[PDB]
Design a binder for this molecule. Sequence first.
Ligand SMILES: *[C@@H]1O[C@H](CO)[C@@H](O)[C@H](O)[C@H]1NC(C)=O
Ligand SMILES: *[C@@H]1O[C@H](CO)[C@@H](O)[C@H](O)[C@H]1NC(C)=O
Ligand SMILES: *[C@@H]1O[C@H](CO)[C@@H](O)[C@H](O)[C@H]1NC(C)=O
Ligand SMILES: *[C@@H]1O[C@H](CO)[C@@H](O)[C@H](O)[C@H]1NC(C)=O
Ligand SMILES: *[C@@H]1O[C@H](CO)[C@@H](O)[C@H](O)[C@H]1NC(C)=O
Ligand SMILES: *[C@@H]1O[C@H](CO)[C@@H](O)[C@H](O)[C@H]1NC(C)=O
Lengths: 406, 406, 406, 35, 35, 35
Amino acid sequence: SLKRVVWALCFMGSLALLALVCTNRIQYYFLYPHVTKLDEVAATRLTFPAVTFCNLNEFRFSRVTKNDLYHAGELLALLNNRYEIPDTQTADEKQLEILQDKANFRNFKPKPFNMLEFYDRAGHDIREMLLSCFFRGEQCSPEDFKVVFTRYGKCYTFNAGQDGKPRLITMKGGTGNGLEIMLDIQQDEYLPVWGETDETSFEAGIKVQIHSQDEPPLIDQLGFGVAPGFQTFVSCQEQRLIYLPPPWGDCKATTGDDTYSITACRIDCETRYLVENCNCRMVHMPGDAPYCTPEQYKECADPALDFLVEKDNEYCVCEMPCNVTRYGKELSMVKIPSKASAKYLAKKYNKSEQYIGENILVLDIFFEALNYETIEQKKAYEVAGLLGDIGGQMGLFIGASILTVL
Amino acid sequence: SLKRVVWALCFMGSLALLALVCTNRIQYYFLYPHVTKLDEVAATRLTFPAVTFCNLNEFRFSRVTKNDLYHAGELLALLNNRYEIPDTQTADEKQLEILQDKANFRNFKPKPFNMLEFYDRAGHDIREMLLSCFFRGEQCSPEDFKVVFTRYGKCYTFNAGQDGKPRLITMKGGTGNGLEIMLDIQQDEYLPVWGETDETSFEAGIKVQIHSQDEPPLIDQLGFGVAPGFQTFVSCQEQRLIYLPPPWGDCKATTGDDTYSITACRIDCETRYLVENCNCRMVHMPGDAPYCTPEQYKECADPALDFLVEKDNEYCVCEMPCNVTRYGKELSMVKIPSKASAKYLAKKYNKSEQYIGENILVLDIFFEALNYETIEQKKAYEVAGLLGDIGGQMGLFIGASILTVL
Amino acid sequence: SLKRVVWALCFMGSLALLALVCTNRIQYYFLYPHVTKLDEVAATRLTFPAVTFCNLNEFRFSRVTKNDLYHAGELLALLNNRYEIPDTQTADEKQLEILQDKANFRNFKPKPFNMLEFYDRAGHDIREMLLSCFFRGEQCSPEDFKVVFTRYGKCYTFNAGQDGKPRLITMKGGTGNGLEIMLDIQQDEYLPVWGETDETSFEAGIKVQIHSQDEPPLIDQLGFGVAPGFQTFVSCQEQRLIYLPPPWGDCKATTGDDTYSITACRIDCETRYLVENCNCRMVHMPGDAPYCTPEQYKECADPALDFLVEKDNEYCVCEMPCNVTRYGKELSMVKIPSKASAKYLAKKYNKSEQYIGENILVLDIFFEALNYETIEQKKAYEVAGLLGDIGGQMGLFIGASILTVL
Amino acid sequence: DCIPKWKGCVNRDCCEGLECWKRRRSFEVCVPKTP
Amino acid sequence: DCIPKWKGCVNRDCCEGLECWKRRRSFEVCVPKTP
Amino acid sequence: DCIPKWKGCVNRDCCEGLECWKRRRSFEVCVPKTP
Ligand SMILES: *[C@@H]1O[C@H](CO)[C@@H](O)[C@H](O)[C@H]1NC(C)=O
Ligand SMILES: *[C@@H]1O[C@H](CO)[C@@H](O)[C@H](O)[C@H]1NC(C)=O
Ligand SMILES: *[C@@H]1O[C@H](CO)[C@@H](O)[C@H](O)[C@H]1NC(C)=O
Ligand SMILES: *[C@@H]1O[C@H](CO)[C@@H](O)[C@H](O)[C@H]1NC(C)=O
Ligand SMILES: *[C@@H]1O[C@H](CO)[C@@H](O)[C@H](O)[C@H]1NC(C)=O
Ligand SMILES: *[C@@H]1O[C@H](CO)[C@@H](O)[C@H](O)[C@H]1NC(C)=O
């Protein structure tokens, strides 16, 4: 029964592979497989990123009083356990006579203060700092920067999209279509450093961070420096990339909190922790909780916050977001002033030539192209797809099932 | 007629899905779908990019005469409506006596000039600027930079591939296999800034742009700064990416104009507009049209050109090109001179030590790897593909069509 | 026989396409086709890159003796054919009396030296250079940098993973979770430059390279500058990408040599060549061979090595590796010291204010995110796949083959 | 008297259809009204 | 006497469970023992 | 007299097969003729 055998050979072979492959492709959908779809799209419109920039000096000495120097003084390392100036005290010719007239504790009468208002008043002032501001050739001004408190101090966020204002867009690549600012970093109002502490610093300049408006700055961690006495072009490429919730992916798409962000979750994780461990919240942190004090800072807040972010990694697990924007950047500097325009600007802002080279910087952020790119995780095999391969032939097989029973 | 019904059930089911899916896959080809094919390829040969660099100072004061100071003088803000020096005039000890001997309009006899030749003669000179040039270890020289006029002034493009010269290639990644130049920015020949105007600037240094030779520079918009008194390594990654004409894509593949470029279309769009609105063309613009004048510049050309690029975005729509090269860059600086080599170079170029720190910069461009990457838009479903899925079974179905009519 | 013809028409058509397509898909597997699978994955752990940094000055003058100045002296261009100081000699007020007391060859008695130990002793010392070091908030120290000799001199590699030590990991993006170092570049111990030679340099600062530990530095070629008097943030994105051996790909997966690297093959290619052409090996090169001498250097080693890497590209073909890690970087600088902390640090390290601005730099390397990306070459069509398309139907066709012979 | 397009508007009076706008690198001038 | 968490450990004596750790930007302080 | 490979060619006379080439960071020297 050779041919008779073959007839049943390949006939029983058919249903072999059929169910074989069928369950295979069915299994492949059970792995919940995906594919990363990369796309470069060139629009005529880009929504311009929010730009936050902090000065590195936390407060102006011009703006600090006898009052604040009491409580705060020992936190800035300008003071002793004894409310006095260490043998480590290193300070300017003129600062002495002006420091002590404000440093005299003979017949001292104290009055209350809070670091929120302190940062507010003594922190640097964008009205002062900003010599000129242009977005896309339309003159802007201090009105356009919302204030955000960061661990640096009083800070300023351009293109906020906050307080329900509009988010700016750009019609073209290149310089004229970005933001160009010119600052006096105000070194003269810089506090003296008589020793190392979290509120005191060796570097002079600003720190910037470019974020989606949806994302708050952590300028401490994610920011990039800009030095005085340089024009600095920063030329950006918008890269926007996407993830899936499980089973497919690990991301969390959560507006439950507005929108979910790493910096976002990362921050209240310091909030909860600082509150809890310090029985206080720190000024740049959100919530209804109490503000810290100079004593609170030194002895709990500051150190606790340092251990948190640097040392202990078992506390905060901040899940991977699905929708995420990132801006790739390219920086370059050139001297400013040119030796030719020195005296022009020593006139125009009324400072010394030598001053200009120390305190003046000009920051240019832009897009190199109007194109921007995307990396998306898409579902590889979907219920429709399984019904598209197995299902159709599974309905066909279930059809020849009845005709058989006869 | 249970089994009799099933026989026609699945029989009429077959042609259900058959035409169903068939027209589906036929519909999917009507969407003219595509896929972006990303590839990283490592060759043994890279074609080296064209490198354009402008000085920031438009003309040398050493090279300007009584003649040009008449017409041009008020455009550089060195002059009044009255041909005189403003109360805003801020200028060097020695410049006075040397400025006015050239500034004396008593018994003044004028003579013609044009800004094309002005830029040509008074613009900075690469013979002067370039102290040393090496590509891939073979000493180059001023012969190797074609001159391109930009809104900055006289400018110079390395690895031109123009005037039908060859385009240089690189056999290896790293420094020795790139271009390394050393400039004196020549601050001493920098014009004074007595006020703000388009032809005057606060920053000292150069601006570079790295382009395909096929692409002209817009160094104004797309360029990246380099400061004096620094060695600056710029380390590149060639990223070459492709697009499709419609229906698939939005690109335009046009040699109709040689080859189509954004900067390319972007430029004649300023040309047409500047010509039209100013009844003149500006020196760095192409065409047969007339050159502007200092009066023309100030009162029409300059301002009109500013409104064009910054403000009004409804004029120029410049379509997305299919074939496009982009060079990704990484920059870093180090002090030059070292305090050790200061006096060596104060000797060797015959300037002061202090001079060297202001005027001397060294630019190193290279590839980090010989690899370079590509992002290509490929056609997902093609006529061959539809005939490959539906067609074969559509010919098979049309076959069982005849045997049926019997 | 119309319908009779059709019956054989489509019947002979079936086997047409069947074998047609079948051999097509069989042919497509013969092209050994592949696909590049791009993936962005966000882990909770990143393995931190090795970080090598060289000082630009090869040896301290503080640390050189009469002895070394004999042999070496003419190689550093501090000497004549006659063992004397050229008319090109340009050197500091105090250096004269201190240079010649060490320069006196009257009654001279020589003693042996080797450039390996020379580099070792006279080369800069990380005990000196490193004012502070922190990784992820845990204070590190000179113990943590293995010494690697490069063409620069004595050099130091952080996060070595060598001498069978562990490779450090990072739990979080941002600054606190990276490495932050603070150096005195030690300009005062910089050798004088009286002329140009491979062992002498115009720039002051360091050079860094960030590599997988598996990959040795070529800091000469692949490194990126860092200048003194700046804090420099360098913020990294780990991009890890893969290739296939032939037929599919061009890569070579070879541990035959531990692991294969371009810099790796690239180096012994200089080793073999330098040895061969110079009958010597250069100090930073591996192997059992002899060390060069100052005479050997000048007259063979140095020049030969220069011709190798810059000029002659027919010698070294170094094949494309399969497994390759690359770190993308973003740099920025800010002034240090602030004019406020100047005197603090002029105290703390006991140098002049003016000194601090020249010699002090602070380098911060970190990851911006914990995410890192991959580009993988995967096999498009595999033996299993061909058996998956043709094979199953080829077994089915071979089945209807027997039933036919009847 | 109105001030034409392209002309310096300093200390100002533009001709019909224009707004006087301060340019980034230089003095303000009258130019076309913009959305 | 032991020194509590959060307190400056300079010239040292931490309370049980803590190690005295030198912070990057400021003085050393006692904090939780770490793996 | 010809100058061998590897030797400083300053103020020049290379041995057969070599061209005298100015190096980036240092003095010119005789080396192999190149395409
Ligand atoms: C993800 O991004 C897209 C594009 O902006 C947006 O429309 C969508 O709302 C985002 N997804 C979710 C679920 O928020
Ligand atoms: C000019 O600058 C000096 C120094 O800052 C200051 O004393 C003066 O108040 C400024 N302007 C004037 C003239 O009031
Ligand atoms: C696109 O790029 C390829 C690769 O260089 C080139 O060969 C081709 O000519 C370009 N396409 C067109 C139509 O110009
Ligand atoms: C040396 O430099 C000075 C200043 O630029 C100049 O006067 C002189 O002409 C230069 N060279 C010589 C010695 O001619
Ligand atoms: C390639 O990279 C993977 C990921 O680390 C590694 O496990 C594997 O060993 C590498 N391949 C080979 C053959 O070395
Ligand atoms: C302080 O610095 C000076 C200059 O380098 C040096 O002479 C002295 O030895 C240093 N320290 C002291 C006080 O010993």
